[PDB]
Amino acid sequence: ALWKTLLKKVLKA
Protein backbone atom coordinates (compact mmCIF):
# COMPACT_ATOMS: atom_id res chain seq x y z
CA ALA A 1 0.00 0.00 0.00
CA LEU A 2 1.36 3.52 -0.63
CA TRP A 3 -1.26 6.20 -1.18
CA LYS A 4 -4.59 4.56 -2.03
CA THR A 5 -4.18 1.95 0.75
CA LEU A 6 -1.02 3.01 2.66
CA LEU A 7 -3.33 5.69 4.05
CA LYS A 8 -5.54 3.00 5.41
CA LYS A 9 -2.35 1.20 6.34
CA VAL A 10 -0.87 4.45 7.36
CA LEU A 11 -2.54 3.78 10.71
CA LYS A 12 0.16 1.10 10.83
CA ALA A 13 2.32 3.06 8.35
Side-chain angles (χ1 to χ4, degrees):
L2 16 279
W3 63 68
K4 95 226 92 99
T5 158
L6 147 135
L7 332 322
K8 269 56 70 71
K9 259 61 108 101
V10 127
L11 282 37
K12 307 175 270 128

